[PDB]
Chain A
Amino acid sequence: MYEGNNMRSMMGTSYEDSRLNKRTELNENMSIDTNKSEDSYGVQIHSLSKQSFTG
């Protein structure tokens, strides 16, 4: 309500949102994509691609 200059340097400008970033996520999906055992009545074992996790 009162203005003054409500932006001061820090923690006068931090009672608002203050840069909501990298919220905790289910990008890798448990209980759906994993924790999954609905795997189809396939034919053979074709391949399982191995990737060196550089990143």
Chain B
Amino acid sequence: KYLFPKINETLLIDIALGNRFNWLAKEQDFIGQYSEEYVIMDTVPINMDLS
């Protein structure tokens, strides 16, 4: 009735976690506020009415 209670094991159950999107890993230099890009509008060909 007089002993201190004897502890013997802690473990810290721990697992890491994932992304499922890490093949989109694109790095940069972090410069500039805005970024943009562009594309061309189509120009269909024409009837050569050479008159």
Which A residues contact B (CB, under 8 angstroms)?
A: 47-50, 52
Count of residues in B whose CB is under 8 Å from the partner chain: 3
Chain A at the B interface: SS class:
loop
Per-residue CB contact flags for chain B residues 15-29 toward chain A (1 = under 8 Å, else 0) read 000000001101000
7 contacts between A and B (CB under 8 A): A47-B23, A48-B23, A49-B23, A50-B23, A50-B24, A50-B26, A52-B26
Q: Which residues on A sit within 8 Å (CB–CB) of B24? A: 50
Nearest CB of A to B44, in Å: 15
Q: Which residues, 7 to 51 on B, are CB-close (under 8 Å) to A?
A: 23-24, 26
Rounded to whole angstroms, the CA-CA distance of A50 and B26 in the bound complex is: 10
